[PDB]
């Protein structure tokens, strides 16, 4: 666990590379260790798809968000929203990789409601974007998406899909 903590705390772009005995140990101390790698890949390999579809669905269900002065009116605010969606998505993916949400809660979520409140970022749209990412991640982990598929040994990843959904629930609770 210390390899990831080092590069996350430094946050300088230095990478931790986990293979061999280090990788065998990583998977040994989490549940469903191999399936968990596939579940993490199902998220990160689809990051742009997940983010664009969630923010697009947030707007198509509530087009007031893209009306003049709306939450994502103008390219700068739309881009900041897509950026936030990916930031959140990636902390969830790291939570699923590590088997806990501590970095998600401490580095990403702590004080996030207050930040959005002061900025006027609408919590309803924010929650909806998270909810769509949650449902999309669920399909990808289960390999039930309509178009993009993942080829892995056949089995049941419901537990990992629930664990991922729980990390999204931590975001929804922090967004309020």
């Amino acid at each position: 666990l210390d390899a990831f903590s080092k590069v996350i705390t430094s946050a300088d772009g230095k990478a931790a590379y986990v293979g061999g005995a280090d990788l065998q140990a990583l998977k040994k101390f989490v549940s469903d260790g191999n399936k968990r790698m596939d579940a993490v890949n199902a998220i990160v390999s689809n990051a742009s798809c997940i983010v664009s579809d969630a923010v697009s669905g947030m707007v198509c269900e509530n087009p007031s968000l893209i009306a003049p002065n709306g939450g994502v009116y103008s390219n700068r605010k739309m881009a900041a929203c897509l950026r936030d969606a990916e930031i959140i998505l990636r902390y969830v993916s790291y939570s699923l990789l590590s088997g806990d949400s501590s970095v998600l809660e401490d580095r990403c979520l702590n004080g996030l409601k207050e930040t959005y409140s002061s900025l006027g970022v609408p919590a309803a749209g924010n929650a909806r974007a998270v909810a769509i990412m949650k449902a999309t991640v669920n399909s990808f982990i289960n390999n039930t998406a309509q178009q993009k598929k993942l080829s892995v040994p056949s089995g049941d990843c419901s537990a990992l899909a629930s664990e991922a959904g729980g990390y999204f629930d931590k975001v929804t609770s922090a967004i309020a």
Binding site: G20, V44, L97
Partner: protein, 63 residues
């Protein structure tokens, strides 16, 4: 408190067990007992994507 640097953990999963390698496939870690497999994590700033922002604004009504 949360960070304010727009940085997030970028997780990359590698499965090169089909044998297709590139320069980055060796030297990053030991592969003992886990040939072809690696997890990479690094902190990266998530940038604005003008192209995607413009695309969503123009296309959001199309599922």
């Amino acid at each position: 408190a949360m960070a304010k640097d727009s940085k997030a953990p970028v997780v990359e999963i590698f499965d090169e067990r089909d044998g297709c390698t590139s320069a980055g496939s060796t030297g990053k870690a030991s592969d003992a007992g886990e040939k072809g497999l690696l997890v990479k994590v690094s902190m990266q700033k998530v940038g604005y994507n003008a192209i995607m922002a413009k695309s969503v604004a123009a296309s959001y009504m199309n599922a």
